[PDB]
Symmetry: D2
């Protein structure tokens, strides 16, 4: 799945996800969000199962983006957890956690949860 | 917070989290889970806000572990999203998503959610 | 939105969600899951904002199902949290938490997280 | 566990959770949050497994609060999903989803995720 994961992905929000999969299980690339306190590209890093089950199952993976680059700092970090599914319509189905740096008093409202679906098209 | 994040962390389950923070916002190290289908150390990678807010707020961060090493493969990947809080009792408060590689029929039950608290002690 | 919420809903899994909305904000009805350790109808209860914002926003709501009826007991309970969106294609977009009764040793893996979208059609 | 669940609970934020458990699996009561856009008591409803496993496991449960009462309307709703654990130090361990009514453009940032622990004391 190293070949299938590597490339440019887009989600339902119009965000752009460019990633290279290493043979070891490494994930490296850049993320560009279409929404939120974000501008241009952001460094991402993550991991994936380099030897997934051969019974029609998807490939587990995850990656992190800290929302600080040369243009902005949203003092937050998102992690995507999900699986890559190959085939004619390859997808990456994820759920995500967005944690914002806060004081201890505001910790209870520091984390957003959501889900993205990434496709190779559009 | 580069100095404060770098080092060995332990959670409420007795898991061991060893990480090096780069000046750029990079996170690299190894994870050892005390529970689940896991044995010995696993490669982790992640990101953190290298220039957090200076108003008593915590530092946002996240990291990924794919549960495959030389000993086992749980065909799953966990991402931790949360914040680092410094001070006399430094903590890393996280919430996590554990996605298991599954078929499309079993996708609905592929992801576990939970929370860990990491301390420098014990 | 009392009229719009009341009725039969279906999700992406083919589950059936029948609910009555009270003028007070009450939600009552039955749930039938197409997947998992579940059979026939299950009692649901929940709440919704009976006076939502009039600026094109959705109506916040939530409901609980304990997976015990006269046929089975999965020793688990799901809560859906999300919003109702009206219009020609009325939807209920949710995220859910499925907690399974476990021992303290297995608490870390007791909770599933996911998302459902409910429509009036199909 | 009907007797054990029924009563007044408090969480780590100092919120107050008063609930009556029905023999059928029903949960009814009021919630008072110590934080957020909330004031005084709010109606809650939920479900619990009335016949849990007798192997030292906890009792699965869930409840919903829509944050509208006679004093305020935060146009949001929280659902708690978790388990009740009996014994000398009875607890209710939960994870929660807080959905805010939003426009379709802001849907991605509509839901907060967190966790509360409820005890009978303090
Ligand atoms: Cl925006
Ligand atoms: Cl802008
Ligand atoms: Cl295998
Ligand atoms: Cl940087
Ligand atoms: Cl185990
Ligand atoms: Cl073992
Ligand atoms: Cl700042
Ligand atoms: Cl490897
Ligand atoms: Cl099934
Ligand atoms: Cl069956
Ligand atoms: Cl309003
Ligand atoms: Cl019953
Ligand atoms: Cl507040
Ligand atoms: Cl106030
Ligand atoms: Cl049983
Ligand atoms: Cl009301
Ligand atoms: Rh969706
Ligand atoms: Rh906890
Ligand atoms: Rh989806
Ligand atoms: Rh906690």
């Amino acid at each position: 799945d190293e070949a299938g994961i590597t490339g440019t992905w887009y989600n339902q929000l119009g965000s752009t996800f460019i990633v290279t999969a290493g043979a070891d299980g490494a994930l490296t690339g850049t993320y560009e969000s279409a929404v939120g306190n974000a501008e241009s590209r952001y460094v991402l890093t993550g991991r994936y199962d380099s030897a997934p089950a051969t019974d029609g199952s998807g490939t587990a993976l995850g990656w992190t983006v800290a929302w600080k680059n040369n243009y902005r700092n949203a003092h937050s970090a998102t992690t995507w957890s999900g699986q890559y599914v190959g085939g004619a319509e390859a997808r990456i189905n994820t759920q995500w956690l967005l944690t914002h740096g806060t004081t201890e008093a505001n910790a209870w409202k520091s984390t957003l949860v959501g889900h993205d679906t990434f496709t190779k098209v559009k």
